[PDB]
Assembly symmetry: D2
Homo-oligomer: 391 residues x 4
């Protein structure tokens, strides 16, 4: 079996030929799942006989077979990624929109910063633009923490304190409308890891985002967090209103919960790391790169459902109709995009349109679904003129 | 090729019923339009009970492609009898919910027994199953809303249609002075004004009728005049809407509102059965292609938009919860029918008269929750990791 | 006493001297209450103590009350001069757009402006074009509400309609108030439920006749036809009310809408309409005929709702600033009531953005700005305002 | 002149007889306007008899003759006070039999008041006084202070400025113009609070308002409950939410400390009055800014006009529209169970019972107000010339 891949790649094969063929499939040599194989190549170090090849490739053979036999959701990645660069370049030319000035940290970012990162459910990676520049999740974290809550607590409990539908502060039942709005996000924040101090709660959530991202970059911006606390009049009013209406679980410290809320909003990521988080959501709770199970299918289901209707702010309904993909946006200019069973994505540009969404990101998401059939209600069998990367 | 099949069915001669029996186990019905030539030749040959390589080849030759897929288990649900058995359990479970109230606002709806319950399944490959009362005619009512909206977009395209109507749910008119969506009476009335403009109601009606006939694979589609007359007597609500829409200039130029309402009431009065309606849903799940006729009815654009709205707006006020828990595009009506669509897989019609507080069929809502609970068909369920759920696609 | 009045005026009084003095009191010789006196005068230039008392004796109470300065506004000539100033100041506002939704309304000249005043004591003043007939439109809403309450009582009337502002149906599933189309449509269904539509219309007409002291009241079939031709909003409301069962059982909703349109199509003039207002200000008693048209209950409720609901969307602001119960209509008329003092009809065609007459509103502000007539103004300490009652 | 009066009330007048006649007018011997006359009677009584003669009466009533003349000449707004007084008692006794309602428990201070407490105080525009029930028991103004502090703002700042930050009409937190609907809602009151006495500390603001309330009450009891204030600022989640929202929407004037304003707000709610003291405040409103008993001008006619217009529509909470339609009087209520009632040009009142109904208004107060208008024509839109079964205390 290790020998087949060998012939598939002629008495002896050079390393760079095996590596290039590997990178071709969309995989990265730094992939955690390939670690054992890459450790061996380190020791071996130029030409590989049947024996040496089999020696290094053993542990990781199953994953390597899938890549080379093109079993991945997108068999031809190189062509698909070329399309991604087109859409990226196409969106790059939209200079409209406004960068958030409400805090110095948001205003400091250049409007020209633009990047897109793709991570499939099989771990295939592609990046273009500025994908390595750290930025705060802001509202993009709302789906993530909601997932954590539903994962730990469960659906029945979590929705006792919050609503499952769009709006149009509280609903008929005196619950916030959903987890994707500040009022609802705040309540969700109070549900996580009850009984411990903010430090531990924050360590717990942080560990969780690390799992979703396959231990890729996750960080915290204290500068943003501090300015978030000073300008938080809007959220304080909500916090007091929730407290008054008894929306919080018993024993809750409201003023403290708000600071945790601001902390979570100040969490830093990159297009690349975030795309892995979205891929976990598209992969049913399993981190595509690490293969580990981060979230229960129940949590991922609920989150994608609410990201669908509630994710884009006031542009949600429009977005659900035209784009048909679950997504979440934040004032940093990030858009966390998920294509179920296919991939996950993070688009980042600071300038936002009048509705609070990234101009480029929105332009990119539209073109994406126009090009391929990722639309939730697109038909796999008959898509018309659309392109299916899965074939 | 045809010979390959013949071998799959041991001895030199095949009993004619053996082939038919094995055929049926696929969920396919011998009356299937795509099977006519095979079945015609089969009874003609049977006129002059055994088959041979060259005989079975003579009968199956014309339809060979479909037969192969059926016997090779290439259909979306490869094991139909298993999936079928589950459907019955779900049906049998929902049958035990006797709650709900049959709609009395007109004599026609009130006449129906609370105990009438049935479900029909038509997959994207034309696989068929029914249990309960699937042969009883009933009006679509609001179930027609998505169907006539699909027809509008198909002919007029998206830009034009939604110029007069909204694409989202509602907490009469939205901020743009348009009905919130096609799934509400106001929106449905405007959609009705868009179809087949410039002609009389009789022509418009026939235009939609043939259209529904295609979606149903020429299965039963009918009209209840008794319901139509009652509908137009009791229509104060919809008449109020018509004048408001007229006042707010929500109709295409040269529109007769009173005439549109009449067309509207007729479209609600169009009647079907669980079985024929199941094919309708399947066509929506098939991307616009009628599963049993293999014929193109609606454009992928029209079908997509229709499913998008059935997701959010289809369930009345229970839409938000239905979308969250069930996660399937569906439409409900006062007759107690629920038009259900599982994309890429199948479509159904669940019909019971008794309605809940929301106006949705009690047994239908129950059945849908169980279906998605049992199976991974939920919109955001994962095709790779579904946990405890079942995947009938294997 | 008729002797008394005589010396108040030589051994001989010429009629013109008596006639001039009387007009000065704000009264008209055409006044229905002075009919007997005026009959005698024509039945007879100069006259003595005996001939005077002969003509005057029958009206002596009103005449003595007038000449003794007992009328609500003792000095009318001054007050009249102020009304003219306000009229002239408002005359300079040409902004506003005449209502075009029907031909009849669009025909009216933007420059048509008039003000009529009728006190509770029958004093009359008019300036501008006060003799020109125009449709009451929404100005009739309080009038037909007063009629309803009068006949049916407050308890019955308010099962079908709300008592307060809005900001179609309230929580109770009733129209918010009588001053909005939805409510006026329901109110219209309450009146004379037994008879046919022709008799109903006659009944209201006669009622409006008493209210106007038998002054001009008329009907425009032109407006009525145009009105019913475009009813879509009002038909929309009608069907919604019918569906919500907001009408009294046995009602023909569609027939009612006809009646509704007819009522909006009734014609008045600034002068005749000002009397209608004066009746509302006088507690249901027509100032000039001394007759009792409306119950004090109907008048109280009517003035209450005109206060909050009368001005369309400008009602709240009008109540806060002007502080007078009033009703406005699409024809550009404003039915103004100053309780215990007088009543008025301000008419100019051009509407403002809120649907109220531009000049009319301008006039109402200056009036309350100049005088203490504001609802919550204090009679004792009003500061720099004028009190015409003194 | 003083002689005329002397006769109209033998060759000599017993002092108690003059005192008994004066009290009949509804006036009080404690009337600040009567002090000179009253000091004289006491002094004179020392230097002599118990009996008074022409020359002597001339000595005592000389200074106050004007007011005394109008009292004995039946020229007060209500000529027969004792008949009217007799009626007020009947209404009080009728309303007293309504045992429904729940006393506000949201803080300890309100719950401590017994449900049985019921009282009504009347002060006419001429200073005529009547009280029945418990009118001497102190209680916090609460929302009853809303129109008062708003009047102070309009008096100092005028209408145009004050209403930039607040709406002039009912609701149905912010209106279409992004302002609080009116001064009578917590959101509006909090904004009105920010307008008063800017540039100075809370202790100064509080004193400035306090002395203003003293004028309106004719220097009768005005007090502060710290027990209630502390409880108020612990329970203020609702108002803190509003404050932050107001702060976010830029509703406050420049350089405004919101948390400091909320504290000032709670203090104003905690100010204590009695039915008798408060009734005088209401009468000052009915008198057009003049305190009936002191004859002093507290507020501008403009300030009072606006306040009454808003009390009319916005004063009763959600019962405002119904109240305005039936009762037809400007009024304000508070969680303490007090109702500040004003009859323009006639009198002013304070009705107090702790138990509140579903709408937050005291059952007894509301019941009383209804009977009050049923009996007499005080309705804003009642006619002075024509009323049906109603009686007119202003008529002889
Ligand atoms: N930290 C901000 C982010 C707002 C947003 O991204 O929409 C908040 O929670 O209000
Ligand atoms: N024809 C009925 C259908 C109602 C419904 O199914 O919701 C109507 O327009 O009211
Ligand atoms: N006849 C018009 C009158 C509108 C108005 O006067 O404001 C209607 O009923 O709508
Ligand atoms: N002082 C409390 C209650 C006022 C009241 O409603 O009486 C507040 O401002 O919320």
């Amino acid at each position: 079996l290790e020998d087949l891949l060998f012939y598939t790649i002629q008495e002896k094969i050079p390393v760079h030929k095996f590596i290039t063929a590997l990178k071709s499939t969309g995989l990265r040599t730094s992939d955690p799942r390939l670690k054992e194989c890459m450790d061996m190549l380190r020791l071996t170090l130029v030409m590989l006989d049947k024996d040496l090849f089999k020696k290094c490739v053993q542990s990781n053979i199953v994953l390597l077979t899938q890549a080379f036999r093109r079993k991945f959701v997108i068999p031809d990645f190189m062509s698909f990624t070329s399309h991604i660069d087109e859409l990226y370049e196409s969106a790059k030319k939209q200079s409209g929109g406004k960068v958030a000035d409400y805090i110095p940290q948001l205003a400091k970012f250049s409007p020209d910063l633009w990047g897109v990162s793709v991570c499939t459910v099989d771990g295939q990676r592609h990046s273009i633009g500025d994908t390595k520049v750290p930025f705060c999740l802001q509202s993009c974290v709302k789906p993530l923490k909601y997932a954590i809550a539903v994962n730990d607590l469960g659906t029945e409990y979590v929705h006792r304190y919050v609503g499952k539908e769009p709006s149009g502060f509280l609903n008929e039942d005196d619950k916030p409308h959903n987890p994707m709005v500040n009022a609802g996000a705040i309540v969700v924040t109070s549900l996580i890891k009850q009984g411990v101090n903010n430090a531990e709660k924050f360590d717990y959530v942080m560990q969780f985002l690390n799992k979703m991202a396959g231990n890729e970059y996750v960080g915290f911006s204290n500068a943003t967090f501090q300015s978030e606390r000073e300008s938080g009049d809007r959220n304080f009013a909500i916090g007091y209103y929730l407290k008054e209406k008894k929306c919080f679980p018993e024993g809750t410290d409201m003023v403290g919960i708000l600071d945790f809320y601001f902390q979570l909003c100040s969490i830093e990521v990159t297009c690349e790391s975030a795309s892995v988080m979205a891929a976990t959501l598209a992969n049913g709770g399993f981190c595509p790169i690490t293969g580990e199970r981060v979230l229960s299918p129940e949590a991922v289901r609920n989150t994608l459902s609410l990201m669908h209707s509630c994710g884009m702010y006031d542009f949600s309904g429009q977005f659900a109709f035209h784009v048909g993909l679950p997504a979440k946006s934040g004032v940093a200019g990030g858009i966390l995009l998920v294509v179920p069973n296919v991939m996950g994505m993070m688009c980042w540009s600071p300038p936002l349109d009048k509705m609070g969404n990234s101009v480029k990101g929105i332009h990119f998401c539209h073109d994406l679904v126009s090009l391929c059939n990722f639309h939730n209600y697109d038909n796999l069998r008959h898509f018309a003129k659309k392109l299916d990367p899965r074939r």
